[PDB]
Design an enzyme around this catalytic site. Structure first.
Site, PDB file in Angstrom:
ATOM      1  N   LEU A 139       0.845  -1.183   0.000  1.00  0.00           N
ATOM      2  CA  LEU A 139       0.000   0.000   0.000  1.00  0.00           C
ATOM      3  C   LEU A 139       0.883   1.235   0.000  1.00  0.00           C
ATOM      4  CD1 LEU A 139      -1.644   0.851   3.447  1.00  0.00           C
ATOM      5  CD2 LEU A 139       0.241  -0.708   3.260  1.00  0.00           C
ATOM      6  N   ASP A 140       0.366   2.305  -0.590  1.00  0.00           N
ATOM      7  CA  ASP A 140       1.125   3.531  -0.767  1.00  0.00           C
ATOM      8  C   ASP A 140       1.006   4.404   0.477  1.00  0.00           C
ATOM      9  OD1 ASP A 140       1.948   2.748  -3.288  1.00  0.00           O
ATOM     10  OD2 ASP A 140       0.250   3.721  -4.286  1.00  0.00           O
TER      11      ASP A 140
END
Lengths: 128, 73, 87, 89, 176
Positions: free
Chosen positions: C41-42
């Site tokens: 995930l960013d």
């Protein structure tokens, strides 16, 4: 999509749209770093003279004493009587005073004449 | 100290508001929700709470019988 | 007006609400794991995790602190710092 | 130092344009860019980036009287269209 | 205006605007599911232009984002009842005596609470013993005359505590 938020003496400009935080100069970042250095040194010596268990009393702030002596004792020096000071002194010292003076003489002369005739509410006017 | 924490893979969302908004957002072309976090806010002893007028309908679902008994008194 | 808390219980609750989320697998979700490196995930989804757990626990953490969580162990530690979890 | 700051701040790979014309292939120039212009700076400083501030056209007049010249040069100007609108056309 | 750096890492400014827009949309939108819809639409609108490799285009979109945010903000954001300006904002502050005190009690009450006061004495031993050499030498040795930061190093030397621990550890429970 807005009238662009005019600033004023009450309209505090928030830190989102400055817009001076867009074309940032490298020397302005250097000024921010110098500001960080000043706060770093000051909080460093605060934590030096603050966490000492050998120390007993107050922190002895020099800047607050500086501000207080600037606010109280450093008024009368320096001063020169300029045009703005003299004009604003005549405006705040004499103006409203002579205003209340003339309205008190006016209402007093109205009362004096109306009791000089005798057509007052003195049917009973006991507590003078 | 236990709380026993009623676990995941239990909701499997299926609910009507989140189902309609997932289908609308899929037809829009996104298909990326948060997840099933609103399921314990939506169903259980939840899921058909009464509307506005039903709260005022709650007043007379028991009082008519006692009122007609008191009229007969 | 006295909610009891425990470190292992709040650790399991934060792990549970992480496991509720979609795009990370419920199989491989560690107590001690990175966010940007391994979970896939960013930054944006990580701050969405932050926002959801702020909304559940009822106290925000600032963006000046949101730079530097990166792992659930420090999340449990910081929320335990806010709650002061002992008897 | 100020020239070095100019080179570090302004000549940047996101804002520069390589354009060519003549008897040469587009993929050939792509290859030459992939050799040379792939691997440039491409990396700004600490967010110290320029942006077009909207310039304030005042509208006024200046005159430089100097009476030793054979001819005189007078310019007058009004507003511009910019680049986007067909007012430029 | 931040503890660590002087600039604030433009990505983080974008992230701050993200959190504040998402919070103001929480305040804007009840029922939580149309809220989820609007939040995913806003998240998609941010992801429309995520991989722009420029910077002037990015900060131009940032300026226009600030304009649209300040136009479409909300007066009372749903700030939590621990947040500054919220409902509590140290609501139960009433019993926050910092524990430099409690040594000025009468010795009858100090005879009433023997265990806590003996253990306070051994914490005081721990405070005094590690105070002079290690703490002052780490503060005067590893920093430069310009300290240039606000973070303090751990006492990784051999043994005892990293400095300045007293007021940081011994602050109250924040709910009496």
């Amino acid at each position: 999509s807005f009238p662009k938020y005019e600033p004023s003496r009450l309209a505090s400009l928030p830190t989102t749209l400055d817009p001076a935080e867009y074309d940032i100069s490298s020397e302005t970042r250097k000024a921010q770093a110098e500001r960080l250095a000043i706060r770093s040194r000051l909080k460093r010596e605060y934590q030096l003279q603050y966490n000492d268990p050998s120390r007993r009393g107050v922190v002895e702030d020099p800047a607050l004493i500086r501000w207080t002596c600037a606010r109280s004792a450093n008024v009368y020096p320096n001063f020169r009587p300029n045009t703005k000071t003299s004009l604003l002194g005549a405006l705040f010292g004499i103006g409203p005073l002579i205003f209340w003076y003339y309205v008190f003489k006016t209402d007093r002369d109205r009362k004096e004449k109306l009791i000089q005739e005798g057509k007052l509410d003195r049917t009973f006017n006991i507590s003078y | 100290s236990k709380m026993e924490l009623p676990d995941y893979k239990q909701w499997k969302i299926e609910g009507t508001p989140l189902e309609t908004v997932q289908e609308k957002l899929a037809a829009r072309g996104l298909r990326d929700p948060w997840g099933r976090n609103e399921a314990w806010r939506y169903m259980g002893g939840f899921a058909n709470n009464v509307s506005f007028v039903g709260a005022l309908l709650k007043g007379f679902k028991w009082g008519f019988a006692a009122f007609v008994v008191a009229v007969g008194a | 007006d006295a909610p009891p808390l425990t470190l292992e219980g709040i650790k399991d609750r934060v792990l549970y609400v992480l496991k509720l989320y979609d795009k990370i697998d419920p199989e491989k979700l560690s107590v001690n794991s990175h966010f940007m490196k391994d979970l896939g995930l960013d930054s944006l989804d990580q701050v969405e995790i932050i926002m959801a757990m702020e909304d559940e626990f009822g106290f925000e953490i600032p963006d000046i602190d949101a730079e530097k969580l990166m792992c659930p162990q420090e999340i449990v530690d910081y929320i335990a710092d806010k709650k002061d979890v002992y008897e | 130092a100020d020239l070095t700051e100019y080179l570090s701040r302004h000549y940047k790979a996101p804002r520069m344009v390589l354009a060519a014309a003549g008897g040469l292939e587009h993929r050939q120039l792509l290859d030459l860019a992939q050799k040379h212009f792939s691997g440039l700076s491409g990396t700004y400083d600490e967010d110290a980036v320029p942006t077009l501030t909207p310039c304030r056209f005042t509208g006024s007049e200046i005159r430089h009287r100097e009476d030793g010249l054979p001819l005189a040069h007078v310019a007058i100007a009004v507003e511009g269209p910019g680049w986007a609108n067909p007012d430029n056309v | 205006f931040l503890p660590s750096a002087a600039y604030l890492t433009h990505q983080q400014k974008v992230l701050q605007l993200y959190k504040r827009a998402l919070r103001h949309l929480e305040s804007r939108c009840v029922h939580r599911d149309k809220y989820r819809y609007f939040a995913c639409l806003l998240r998609a609108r941010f992801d429309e232009h995520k991989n722009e490799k420029d910077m002037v285009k990015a900060t131009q979109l940032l300026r226009e984002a600030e304009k649209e945010f300040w136009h479409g903000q909300h007066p009372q954001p749903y700030i939590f009842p621990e947040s500054p300006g919220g409902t509590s904002y140290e609501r139960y502050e009433c019993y926050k005596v910092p524990e430099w005190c409690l040594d000025d009690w009468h010795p009858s009450e100090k005879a009433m609470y023997p265990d806590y006061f003996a253990k306070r004495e051994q914490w005081k031993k721990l405070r005094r013993e590690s105070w002079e050499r290690e703490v002052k030498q780490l503060q005067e040795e590893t920093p430069v005359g310009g300290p240039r930061t606000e973070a303090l190093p751990p006492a990784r030397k051999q043994g005892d505590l990293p400095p300045l621990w007293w007021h940081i550890v011994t602050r109250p429970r924040e709910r009496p």
